[PDB]
Amino acid sequence: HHHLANTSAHDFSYLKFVYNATDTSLEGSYDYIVIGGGTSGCPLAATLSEKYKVLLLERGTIATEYPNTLTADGFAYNLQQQDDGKTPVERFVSEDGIDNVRARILGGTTIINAGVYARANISFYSQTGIEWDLDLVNKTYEWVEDAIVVKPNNQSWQSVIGEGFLEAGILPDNGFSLDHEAGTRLTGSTFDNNGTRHAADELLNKGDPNNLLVAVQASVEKILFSLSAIGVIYTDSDGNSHQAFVRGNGEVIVSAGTIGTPQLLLLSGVGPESYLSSLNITVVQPNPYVGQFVYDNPRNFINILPPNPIEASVVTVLGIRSDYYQVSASSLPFSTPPFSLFPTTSYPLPNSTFAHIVSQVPGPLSHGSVTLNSSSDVRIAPNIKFNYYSNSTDLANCVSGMKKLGDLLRTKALEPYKARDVLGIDGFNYLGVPLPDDASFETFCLDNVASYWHYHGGSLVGKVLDDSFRVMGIKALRVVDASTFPYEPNSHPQGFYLMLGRYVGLQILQERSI
Ligand SMILES: Cc1cc2nc3c(=O)[nH]c(=O)nc-3n(C[C@H](O)[C@H](O)[C@H](O)COP(=O)(O)OP(=O)(O)OC[C@H]3O[C@@H](n4cnc5c(N)ncnc54)[C@H](O)[C@@H]3O)c2cc1C
Numbered sequence: 001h002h003h004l005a006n007t008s009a010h011d012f013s014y015l016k017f018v019y020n021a022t023d024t025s026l027e028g029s030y031d032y033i034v035i036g037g038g039t040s041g042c043p044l045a046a047t048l049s050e051k052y053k054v055l056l057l058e059r060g061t062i063a064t065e066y067p068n069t070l071t072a073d074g075f076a077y078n079l080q081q082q083d084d085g086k087t088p089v090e091r092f093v094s095e096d097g098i099d100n101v102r103a104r105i106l107g108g109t110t111i112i113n114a115g116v117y118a119r120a121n122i123s124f125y126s127q128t129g130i131e132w133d134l135d136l137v138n139k140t141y142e143w144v145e146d147a148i149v150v151k152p153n154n155q156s157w158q159s160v161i162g163e164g165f166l167e168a169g170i171l172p173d174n175g176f177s178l179d180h181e182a183g184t185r186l187t188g189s190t191f192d193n194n195g196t197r198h199a200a201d202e203l204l205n206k207g208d209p210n211n212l213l214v215a216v217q218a219s220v221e222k223i224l225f226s227l228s229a230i231g232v233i234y235t236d237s238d239g240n241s242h243q244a245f246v247r248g249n250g251e252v253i254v255s256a257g258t259i260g261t262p263q264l265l266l267l268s269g270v271g272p273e274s275y276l277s278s279l280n281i282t283v284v285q286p287n288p289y290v291g292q293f294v295y296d297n298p299r300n301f302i303n304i305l306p307p308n309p310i311e312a313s314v315v316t317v318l319g320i321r322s323d324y325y326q327v328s329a330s331s332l333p334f335s336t337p338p339f340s341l342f343p344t345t346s347y348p349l350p351n352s353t354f355a356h357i358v359s360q361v362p363g364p365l366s367h368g369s370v371t372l373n374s375s376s377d378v379r380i381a382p383n384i385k386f387n388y389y390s391n392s393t394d395l396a397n398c399v400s401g402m403k404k405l406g407d408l409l410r411t412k413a414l415e416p417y418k419a420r421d422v423l424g425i426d427g428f429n430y431l432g433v434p435l436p437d438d439a440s441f442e443t444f445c446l447d448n449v450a451s452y453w454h455y456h457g458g459s460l461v462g463k464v465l466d467d468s469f470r471v472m473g474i475k476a477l478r479v480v481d482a483s484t485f486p487y488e489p490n491s492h493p494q495g496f497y498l499m500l501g502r503y504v505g506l507q508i509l510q511e512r513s514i
Pocket residue numbers: 035036037038039040041057058059060101102103104105106107108109110112113114115116117118218219220221255256257258260261264378452453454455480481482483491492493494495497
């Protein structure tokens with residue numbers, strides 16, 4: 001861990017090659033166009049820019065416009081803030097009725113997220129069947145980690161929860177480790193030890209400033225085709241249209257996220273033939289899987305209200321089993337809810353410091369889809385449905401996770417945070433529904449599910465893409481973001497998708513060097 005980032009201010013040096021999409025002089029030909037300045041898209045664009053002329057198009061603005069994105073303390077503020085169409089948090093509600101958010105900002109979800117950093121479970125690579133260059137994967141993790149990842153300092157709540165996971169039998173003790181492994185560990189964070197957020201936008205500082213151009217408030221509406229992708233149409237904040245193209249052996253990559261990538265493919269006539277024909281969208285490339293296999297790992301939780309104040313913390317201490325991944329954060333109270341922290345706006349608000357104690361279902365096996373709400377306007381959010389707990393294996397895994405949270409609440413570690421010194425976990429004061437017979441745990445899992453925010457899928461490798469992230473049947477078109485896999489790489493996937501953007505950039509540059 002010689003290589004990890006130090007405490008430092010958020011590096012906005014890259015703003016020297018960031019322009020308003022209102023600038024028509026950005027229109028023209030590039031070697032690469034990357035759609036979406038987010039978790040995968042920023043490192044992808046930085047990496048291609050080492051050798052080639054790159055245009056990165058981001059629909060949001062720069063994070064300096066929203067300073068509460070740049071500190072650990074600001075996390076809740078960005079979710080509390082009303083969505084006016086400009087804000088870094090975009091609010092949505094799945095058709096399941098569960099409140100959710102996605103990013104709208106240069107840096108993508110790494111600018112608004114909970115900062116937890118992990119590398120992929122090392123069994124993930126073989127599970128995919130992709131011929132990964134594993135040495136290069138690890139060099140690329142170090143490239144990300146040297147820029148924006150730290151070893152967290154001690155936080156009293158994270159240390160309580162770590163002792164509790166160990167006492168609850170989530171073994172072994174892995175100490176400090178970036179790796180997704182069974183047991184309890186301190187992992188990395190993209191918040192530094194002064195609370196400064198570091199993010200994917202900082203990876204643009206690794207780009208060649210003579211080769212990389214970024215347009216912000218660039219809403220990419222259509223991929224243009226020859227069958228080859230040739231370019232994009234994008235609109236600016238004033239509503240005017242702009243075109244950009246790729247040249248020679250160049251490519252368009254879609255990095256618009258689980259929601260934005262399938263949406264743009266569909267709008268561009270890449271998607272299921274009967275569905276697109278039903279909307280009178282001319283089919284450029286029939287593929288029955290665009291917007292299919294869309295996943296949201298369940299979050300289930302209790303909230304305890306200790307009788308004495310607890311210090312607020314960012315999540316750094318993870319409890320990992322194959323069937324559930326658990327963490328806890330401690331928070332100040334609030335009178336405005338952070339949107340999607342609880343599954344609906346109609347949720348009791350805490351009046352005192354509280355601990356959010358959570359469990360994540362792996363996979364999940366339940367899936368849904370993304371469909372268009374507008375056949376024309378990319379600023380109109382698509383419909384999304386996850387079908388939480390439609391697969392009974394997911395419900396069984398939540399039962400196991402909820403019993404383990406019961407074990408955690410029974411530990412000597414957590415005993416001092418009880419309101420009453422009674423033998424039972426009814427000694428805790430709860431915000432919302434306390435833990436409750438498999439049927440009671442089943443009801444609790446179904447009724448109180450929230451989003452883990454780790455949604456993925458909709459443009460899967462093996463369905464829409466080949467093992468090189470190419471859209472099947474289309475030249476010069478790739479997708480690189482969380483739309484690409486039907487299972488998590490680990491409990492906290494930002495690390496994997498930061499790595500993936502640069503990795504695929506390197507694979508593109510290698511493919512082309514021959
Ligand atoms: C609140 C929250 C907390 C999280 N906490 C953690 C955590 O602590 N650790 C962790 O590992 N994971 C966390 N995650 C998940 C993780 O951050 C995401 O899964 C990951 O960042 C997704 O990366 P992506 O590149 O697929 O998407 P994004 O990073 O969202 O990138 C997509 C980008 O495309 C842009 N865009 C979309 N459509 C268009 C268009 N048509 N034209 C132009 N631009 C477009 C978007 O504005 C966005 O910037 C969290 C998620 C959320 C929402």
